[PDB]
């Protein structure tokens with residue numbers, strides 16, 4: 001069919017130091033996708049991880065064209081935008097909606113950890129929503145391999161977003177990849193349930209993190225979170241990453257399994 005190769009760029013979806021993301025619409029079919037446009041070794045690594053992804057809760061990669069030294073990355077479009085924009089400041093969202101998002105988050109993180117990929121920047125800006133509000137883990141530009149040939153490799157690179165980062169990345173030289181992504185999913189949950197972030201970073205100098213370590217859940221944001229999800233957060237936001245709840249045990253948590261949503 002002539003012209004099915006052609007896509008019109010119709011809306012800006014995001015701009016950063018990386019380049020931009022454009023909503024693209026096929027000239028013939030009207031299929032809508034997201035095109036990440038960049039102006040070397042890093043994009044090479046990113047494309048390689050992007051090709052490994054095939055799950056309903058992770059953004060799908062359709063392939064890439066280079067024109068000149070400009071790379072175009074075609075991927076699944078999520079027409080409902082980011083989870084960030086469903087969170088009402090100081091309120092959060094309804095507990096059933098939050099639980100449903102957290103289920104989908106866990107499904108995508110399980111998936112990634114299964115294929116030996118860590119995301120390293122899980123936050124509501126990187127969690128996108130399709131036309132039916134299904135959650136898609138986006139942005140693989142910090143993702144890396146933590147398991148290959150069934151052997152684990154420890155991480156040392158400091159990266160992510162401070163209010164989301166686990167405390168071991170601030171205190172230890174090396175750390176396991178999986179407890180880091182689990183912690184950031186906890187902060188996601190807190191945000192959905194409270195419409196606020198609990199601390200600037202999880203350090204001994206941050207009074208809001210000390211308050212948590214001392215159990216002062218009569219303070220915000222914790223006082224806004226019902227006892228059942230707050231139990232779960234007590235098991236996720238544990239400072240020692242070796243004692244921190246794993247995903248298989250999150251799937252056994254009372255709140256996680258509570259029926260809430262129609």
Ligand SMILES: Cc1c(Nc2ncc3cccc(C4CC4)c3n2)cnn1C1CCOCC1
Nearest residue numbers: 013014021034076077078079080081082138
């Ligand atoms: C359709 C839509 C999306 N999708 C959307 N879909 C897929 C994406 C894949 C990679 C990167 C991004 C963007 C950086 C976030 C993506 N983004 C994002 N934002 N949006 C609207 C923009 C205007 O405001 C309403 C929401």
